[model samples]
Target chain A: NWNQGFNNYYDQGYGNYNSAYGGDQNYSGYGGYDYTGYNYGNYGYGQGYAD
Target chain B: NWNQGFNNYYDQGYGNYNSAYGGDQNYSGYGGYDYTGYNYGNYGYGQGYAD
Candidate 1:
């Protein structure tokens, strides 16, 4: 709903920084971004243990 | 990595704006927080403090 969280950093877009990097600039709206490493669980256990 | 541009709006988070590591689809909360106000600067004859 907000720019990468209204903290106080500044990525590289907002007229200067990318909001995803925790920048207050909030220039580049990154609402649907993800870095959960979700599949890491399956990959770690190998195909036998994971679906 | 998306939004309604600079003119859109959404919800309701005091829940966690930038908290979710994954996209708005995976998680619904942020973790911690911080605020780093940039050290503003002023130069001589710069129409700043020189004023």
Candidate 2:
């Protein structure tokens, strides 16, 4: 039926979208890179001065 | 027809998804906060020490 076909296509698209841009991939990269850079810069200098 | 209905629904969902989680909103927040913190900390201390 057309209904079934459409549902299949919709589900496939949704699955692809989630896999491509979902929480794990994007968040991990974003958090890992940005947080590391920010913390390293902040603490590295802030601590250096304090010491 | 079922085809038309499904297409309408699918388009609506896609539109909503893009609007809710598209590039501008997430990137603005991510870039703004993290970059600001990182630059401030890194340059602030690095410059302070240099000066």
Candidate 3:
């Protein structure tokens, strides 16, 4: 549940990105999914994960 | 100006940090600053710096 919520927002941009800002969010009955969102981004490559 | 802004937020939670989160901000006239607050913390170490 917690990880799902984190991934929801995480995938919106950081999952497979290498440019600038991006995001996506959806609600499927929340517990503590604030979807805080990202404001800055920078990395080399293959920095995200899966499950 | 931009880096200053980023550093302000970064300092608030990413600078001089260890084992959790931390923050700091201040102002001095027109562009003193907008001290944004922070929340959430966890276990981590040796990942904070500035210049």
Candidate 4:
């Protein structure tokens, strides 16, 4: 539900990043998740509570 | 029933409030402990204070 955004280094020949701009939007569609995903990130570390 | 009194030049003058600046007496003829006294001068028509 969020986008930190995306960044890609395209080999557009020159060192000018802005000049590379867009590229071939080659989209090869595929299937999705074979397995379920879950949030594994560590939660609040500063609050004092029962461990 | 309280007052804590008198910062006179030994006596407060014409523009002076009273020998009783913080003192109390002759309390407006009121009866319950009558701790109110006269502030002989008028102030705070601007700003009121003390040191």
Model 2 bad stretches (over 4 Å): A1-37, A41-51, B1-29, B32-35, B39-51
lDDT of 1 by residue, A1-51 (tens): 434333332332222222233222211122322322111111122231222
By TM-score, how accurate is candidate 3? Answer: 0.13
Clashing pairs in model 2, backbone N/Cα/C closer than 3 A: none
What's each prediction's TM-score?
A: 0.16, 0.15, 0.13, 0.13
Q: After superposition, how far is residue B8 of candidate 4 from its true place, in Å?
A: 74
CAPRI classification of candidate 2: incorrect
In model 2, what is the error at residue A47, expressed in angstroms?
17
Badly placed stretches (over 4 Å) of model 3 are A1-37, A48-51, B1-32, B37-51
Q: What is the DockQ score, from 0 to 1, of model 4?
A: 0.00
Predicted candidate 2 versus true structure: per-residue lDDT over A13-41, tens digit per residue: 32112122223323211222234343222
The DockQ leader among the candidates is: 2
Ranking by DockQ: 2, 3, 1, 4
Go through the candidates in order and give each one's C-alpha lDDT: 0.27, 0.28, 0.21, 0.22
TM-score of chain A of each: 0.13, 0.13, 0.16, 0.18
Candidate 3: which pairs clash? B12-B23, B27-B32, B28-B32
Error of 1 at B21 (Å): 18
lDDT of candidate 2 over B1-51, digit per residue (tens) = 222223333432331222223232222112212333333233344522222
- Model 1, B1-51: lDDT tens digits are 544224322342222232322323232222333422221122222221111
